[PDB]
Amino acid sequence: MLEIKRYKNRVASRKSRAKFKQLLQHYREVAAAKSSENDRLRLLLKQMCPSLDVDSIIPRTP
Amino acid sequence: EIKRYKNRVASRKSRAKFKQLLQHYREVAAAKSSENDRLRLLLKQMCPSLDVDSIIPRTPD
DNA sequence: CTTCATCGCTCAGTGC
DNA sequence: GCACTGAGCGATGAAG
């Protein structure tokens, strides 16, 4: 039939759906890494310059 | 006859929900990364004499 | 005249 | 009895 057109197209759909899914996971990991670094940074700065409205000059992101 | 239409609707909903999630997390990633940059910045201006890349290494991105 | 990336419809399972 | 989703199949819209 069009066996080869179909194998190619099936490979392509599996590629692109995997692409979006891993990109979503990737963001979730970047968010994770970031929020953790963020708390470390924020607490260290609150420690060091305790006369600064840190959580106001850089409000937390959700 | 009907399972067909209702299934079409749910498949629309699935593609959308997941695009919404990809967007939401796409955004949270940028928000936290900019916040990370400004915190390193402000710590480097308030505690300049101090090494933040060995207390709190950057995670690439 | 390829070659590829998305995505919409459908079907078959998969968890309410 | 049902909503959700992984996946195949054709469009469709580029890219060369």
Author numbering:
A (entry chain A): 174 to 235
B (entry chain B): 176 to 236
The authors write:
The viral bZIP transcription factor ZEBRA (Zta, BZLF1) regulates this cycle by binding to two classes of ZEBRA response elements (ZREs): CpG-free motifs resembling the consensus AP-1 site recognized by cellular bZIP proteins and CpG-containing motifs that are selectively bound by ZEBRA upon cytosine methylation. ZEBRA is a homodimeric protein related to the activating protein 1 (AP-1) family of bZIP transcription factors. ZEBRA regulates the EBV infection cycle by playing key roles both in establishing viral latency and triggering lytic replication. Underpinning ZEBRA’s dual role in prelatency and lytic activation is its ability to recognize two distinct classes of DNA target sites, collectively termed ZEBRA responsive elements (ZREs).
We crystallized ZEBRA’s DNA-binding domain in complex with a 19 base-pair (bp) DNA duplex containing the CpG-methylated ZRE2 site in the EBV promoter Rp (TGAGmCGA; hereafter meZRE2) and solved the structure at 2.5 Å resolution by molecular replacement. Unlike the single helix of a canonical bZIP domain, whose N- and C-terminal residues bind DNA and mediate coiled-coil dimer formation, respectively, ZEBRA’s C-terminal region folds back on and stabilizes an unusually short coiled coil. Our crystal structure closely resembles previous ZEBRA structures bound to the AP-1 site and to the Rp meZRE2 site in an alternate crystal form, apart from the dimerization domain which exhibits variable bending. Each ZEBRA monomer recognizes one of the two meZRE2 half-sites, which we denote ‘A’ (half-site shared with AP-1) and ‘M’ (methylated half-site). Consequently, only a single (hereafter ‘CpG-proximal’) monomer senses the methylation state of meZRE2. The CpG-proximal monomer recognizes DNA bases in the M half-site through direct H-bonding interactions of Asn182 with G2, Ser186 with mC–2′ and mC1, and Arg190 with G0 and G–1′, while electrostatic interactions with the DNA backbone resemble those in the A half-site. Strikingly, the Ser186 side chain is positioned precisely on the local dyad axis that relates the two CpG methylation marks, allowing it to hydrogen bond with both mC bases. By contrast, in the methylated complex the mC1 methyl group sterically selects for the g+ rotamer, thereby stabilizing the H-bonds with the mC bases. In the AP-1 complex, the Arg190 guanidino group forms bidentate H-bonds and is coplanar with the G0 base, whereas in the meZRE2 complex it twists out of this plane to form a bifurcated H-bond with the G–1′ base on the opposite strand. The resulting configuration is strikingly similar to the mC-Arg-G triad observed in methyl-CpG binding proteins (MBPs), whereby a conserved arginine hydrogen bonds with the G base of the CpG motif and contacts the methyl group of the adjacent mC base (analogous to G–1′ and mC–2′ in our structure).
